[model samples]
Target: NSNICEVCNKWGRLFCCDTCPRSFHEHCHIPSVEANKNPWSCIFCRIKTIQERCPESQSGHQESEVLMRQMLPEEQLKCEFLLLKVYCDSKSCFFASEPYYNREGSQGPQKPMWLNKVKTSLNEQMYTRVEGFVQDMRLIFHNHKEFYREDKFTRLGIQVQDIFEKNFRNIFAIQETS
Candidate 1:
C-alpha cells in the first residue's frame, strides 16, 4: 500500500490510483481521497475524460460567463486543469493542506478555504454552477490576503493567484472582467 502523497511527499494514509503507480494522501490529491471507494483512479488517469467530452475548441473561445452557467463536464475538466496548474507550483504545497490558522488557533476565519477542498468539490461534482467553483477558488487567496498581508505567504498567495487567473483566462477564453 502507498503510504505517502506524491504531491507533498509526507507520510500519511494514502489512496492509490488503480491504473497508475502514483498514490496520494486524502488531502494531497486533487480530489480529496474517498473512503471505501474501490477502484479509485487518480487525476492523471482522468485526463481522458476531458478529451472525451469536448475534443478541442473549433475556432474561438466561449465567454467566461457562459462557462459559469452550469457545472458542465467540459468546464469541470478545464477547472480541474486550472487547479492542476496552480498545484504544479512548488510553493503551492503550502496551500494544499489545512491552513495553519487552525493549528495556531489564531484570529483568522474559523472555516478557512483550502485547495484540496475545492478539488474535492470538482471531483464529487458538488458545484451546481461554475460561480460556486470560482468563488471557492478565490476564497483561498482571499483568506491568505486577510491573514498574511505583507508577509511571505501573502506574496506566495499572490503568485499562485496570478497563475490561477492567467490559466483560467486562457483555458476559459475569458476576455475581460473589469
Candidate 2:
C-alpha cells in the first residue's frame, strides 16, 4: 500500500487526517509526526496556520483596490501612451516597416530611428506620470487613513477605470491612424 503527503504529494508511510480524511506524510504534518501523538490533522491545519499568520495578503488586495480608485484620467492617458509606444516599437513596427511586396521570412523588418526616438520619449513620460500618481496615492491614503470609507474607495475605483478605458480608446485610435 502507498501513502502521500496531502500538501506536497510526497509518497511515504502516512495516515489520512481524522478531520478531513486527507493523507499526508508524517513529517509534513505541523509540529512533525513525532511531536503529534493525537490523531493526525493532515496538511489543511498547517495551511490554515500559514494563512492566519499572513495578514499582508489580505491588506495587499485592499491596497490594490485603493490604488485603482486613485488613478486619474491624465495618469491613464500617459499609461496608454506608454503602452502604445511599446506596442508600436515591438509589434506594429514589424508590419509597418516591412516592404509592401516583400517575400515572407526574407528578414525581420527594422524599426525606423524616429520610431525608436518616439518610444524613448513615451517611456520617459510614462515613468514621470506613474511616479507622480504613486506619490499622490500614498499621500492621500496616509492623510485620510482615519476617514477612509469603503464606498468612497469603490467610487474612486470606478472613476479610475472609466478614465483609463477612455484614454486607452483614444490612444488606440491615434495608433490606427499612425
Candidate 3:
C-alpha cells in the first residue's frame, strides 16, 4: 500500500506477497482457475523461488478464488457471477478471455466485427439469463400488486445467496421450486 503497484506500477490499493518485498493489484495477480479443486500459488514469486515447479502449472490457482472457497459453498459461485458483471460491462471486449491485467502500454488484441457481434451477443445472453430469473419484477410485482393473497404484501424481494444456490449451485437431490 504505497505509491504504486509493483506489477502495474500504477497508484492503487495493494496486497503484498507473503514472502517478498513486492506488492500487486489484486487484479494484476488474477488467480488461475483449474479444472480441479487443487489449490495453486502465483508464479509472480514462485518462478524465482523454484525452477522445479513444473512448466504446466505456471498459471496456478487464483489466490482470490481459493480464499473465497473457504466460506459458504455458494460464495464461490457468487464470486464467479460477480466477475461476469465486470466481464460483461460495456468497456470489456466480449469474445476474448483476456488477461486479468493489461500489460504496460499494450492495448490488447483487436478483433473483427464478427467478434464484436459475438461479444454483444454474450452481453445480451447474460442480461437475458439474469433478468429471466427476476423476469417478473416489474411486470407482476410492480404492475399487479393486487395479486398476492396477503393484504400487507407491500414489497417484493430476493436473497442473493438464494439466487446463486438455485441458479448455479450443484446439488444431488435438489428439486425445482418455481
Candidate 4:
C-alpha cells in the first residue's frame, strides 16, 4: 500500500480521495478526513481555495484587522462576560440564580462569578499593556522607517517579549500564594 504523503512526500498512512481518487496523508490534504472517508478534498480542490480566489470586498489585511479587533483583550473580555452571564442564567433554571455568588455542590465550588471578575480585571490590564506595546511598535516603525530593517523588527520583538515577561512576573508576584 502507498504510505507516503502525496503532497509533501512525508511517510504516513495514505488517504485516498473518493472524488479525485488522489491519495494523500491526512495532514497533507486540506480539510482532511480522519479515516479518509466522505467529504474528502485535497488542498488544491478545497472550497476554501475557491472562495479565497473569488473576488471579495475586503482585502486580506482588512479581514485580519477585523479579526484582530474582536480578539483584542477588552473585546474578548466583553464577549466572555456575555457568554458567562448567559451560561449562568441558563444553568440557574435548574436551581436558584445567584448573582455574584459562588456555587458549592457535589463536584466542588463552581467559581464562575470569581473567575469572571478576575478575567475582566486581567483583560483590562492586558489591554493596556498590549496597547502600549502596539503604540511602541508603531512609533518604531514610523520614526525608524529608513533605518529599520528585518533584524530591527526581530530585535523589537525580543524586546517586547522581555518587557512582557518582566511585567507578567511582577504582576503575578503580588498574587502569588505562600
lDDT of 1 at 146: 76
Encode model 4's per-residue lDDT on 52-114: one tens digit a residue: 575351223222233334345433333333222222222212122222322332122233223
Off by over 4 Å in 4: 1-4, 19-22, 27-32, 47-54, 57-60, 63-178
Which residue pairs collide, candidate 2? 69-156, 69-157
Question: Please, what are the lDDT tens digits per residue for candidate 1 over residues 33-151?
Answer: 66776788876667655445765642345555545578776667667767876876777877887776642433686568898788777888999887788888888887887787556
For the record, the alpha-carbon RMSD of candidate 1 to the native fold, in angstroms, is: 5.4
TM-score of each: 0.64, 0.23, 0.25, 0.27
| Winning candidate number (TM-score) | 1
Sorting all predicted structures by TM-score, with the top scorer first, yields 1, 4, 3, 2
Whole-model Cα lDDT per candidate? 0.72, 0.39, 0.35, 0.37
Summed over model 2, clashes come to 2
Model 3 poorest ten-residue lDDT run: 167-176
Q: What is the lDDT of candidate 2?
A: 0.39
Candidate 2, residue 111: Cα displacement in angstroms equals: 44
**lDDT accuracy of residue 62 in candidate 1:** 55
Cα RMSD to the true fold for all candidates: 5.4, 20.7, 19.7, 19.5
Candidate 3's C-alpha runs over 4 A off are 1-3, 32-42, 52-178
Leading candidate by lDDT: 1
**Per-residue lDDT over 1-178 for candidate 2, one digit per residue giving the tens place of the 0 to 100 score:** 2365654456777866665666656533432345554764543454444446864433322323433543354444444343332332222232122123233433322322222333343334533444444443233223222223343543433443344344443432222222
Off by over 4 Å in 1: 1-64, 102-106, 176-178
> What is the number of backbone collisions in each predicted candidate, taken in the order shown?
0, 2, 2, 0
